[PDB]
Amino acid sequence: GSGEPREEAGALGPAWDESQLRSYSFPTRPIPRLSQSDPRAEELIENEEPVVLTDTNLVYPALKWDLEYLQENIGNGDFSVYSASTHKFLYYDEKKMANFQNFKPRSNREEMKFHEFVEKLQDIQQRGGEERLYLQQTLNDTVGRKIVMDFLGFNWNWINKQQGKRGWGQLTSNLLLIGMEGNVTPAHYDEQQNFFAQIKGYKRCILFPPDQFECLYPYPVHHPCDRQSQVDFDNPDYERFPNFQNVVGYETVVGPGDVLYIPMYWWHHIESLLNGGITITVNFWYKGAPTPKRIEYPLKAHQKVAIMRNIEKMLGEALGNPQEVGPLLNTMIKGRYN
Template identity: 35%
Template sequence: MNTNVQDQFKFTEVYQIERIHNPTPEEFQRGFLSVRKPVIITGGMSGWKALSSWTPDYLSTTVGNRQVDVNVSQSRMFMGDTKTGFASLRKTMKFSDFMSVLLEKNRSTSNSYYLQGQPMTTIFPELVQEIETPDYFDKKLLLVINLWLGAHGNISPLHYDASHNLLAQVSGRKRILLFDPKQTSFLYPFPAYSKIPHLSQVNIDEPDFEKFPKFSKAKCIECVLEPGEMLFIPVLWWHQVYSFDTLNIAVNFWWKEKLRQLLLTYSGMRLLAQIPAFFWQEFRNKVNSTSNPK
């Protein structure tokens, strides 16, 4: 495992990420969700067929002919574009061709490929039956279940999301650096009017301290997620994710945070200002729930 970037970071002394085995939903909500504290849950994926079935052959047989959108990077860092919000280079290709490029021993290209956060219910419906939505949140709040499929060396750069997240590791390991939302002023998010206000401008593996001097004060927490484990990433927590091993597969579950909670925070406001559609949907939900009370 590549740990040579590790010493550059200041780690918070407050705590390491705990591992807890099969907490009850109440234990999870009380100890972690309500206080927005990251945690690794072990044992929660023991019923997942995907853990044994998602081999390259099986996936290629099951969804091999499907056209999928894959992000391509020359640097292994999968950064969004400030104008579009998407990866600057994106390819639509047959899933089986993507798997072949990913697993090629002597790659003919120096590019890296990553199927990055593709919604499962619309794009891979047959695979949804081989996972289980965890009981740790109210299913009515579920926004999307995404598939992440890549290889050793891929990096999702430092960013935060407007929803809570359970990142469930199916195959390979991920190293994750987490920064508390209180660190936001040290992390230089892109401007709120750009398409990527949730991404940091700092390349945290090679920080430019002249341009981003306050980054020297940032403190993070590190963990390595093993197959069969789920990491809870609370809303607005910053994370940078490094993939390891030949085949790296994860599924994540994003669920809604209360609008009121987002509006109370600077980071939440920055994201919401981007999405008029979000407000419109919230308004409609409110109207519907008032006109159809349970």
């Protein structure tokens, strides 16, 4: 699992304790925590396996960020804020909601100014409501001068070298994430390479390798929850998802100053520690390296995941309707391949 909690310097006590972690049905083994100068860390990144780097200084300027500082300096732009009644903030793609009319999300998106977010958050705490908020917004040019300055002070030298060494594509975005204690982002995989930079508070990250596809049961590609697991971690339905009983995860708790490499196609479940206050994270999403000219057989798991996504997409467009994908695939396999 996460292991013995780290001791904060100056004898300030344990950073967190196991009682701040939610309880799940599967075993986990810890993600390595290493210096960015450790050759083993380069070896993990090169091999597209997760690693927590403890001393990158990737977002050193931002470690002073809290709500007051951000409210004062982050500008007058609109911020996407998600609202839910449960701790689970399952992501949904708005463009695809037309395909499935029977999908009604359990979280709602609302655009607001930063001070409005701080206000709603302040308001909920005052009256101890159960509503939960999660701000997720990509950093853009509308931020104010001091945030620009902080952003410019990130460790571009280090990360640019990484981008170059791995042959990755361009940085596509930086997502600012601000959450309430207890918030969960359920298990999903992203199609970009991600350096997850923790800034404030603590997040437990549980990762699963691409080869566990069969255990995690993603939604259909056309569904709004494409790339998310259908399994409810709190109450797993083993009758529909029997192989979730075989899932094994790589887990860690990141705190201020840590950077977690989440390789492309790796599943990740991310939770802000219970009773840990608000969390702040900034991610760094890069397009993956181009497909190689020469393909080595047999293919890696993430290549097979890519093939399956493309089959699902092609069939949706060929049949003229994504709801026909399932019946055709079943008709294709029943009594033939199963």
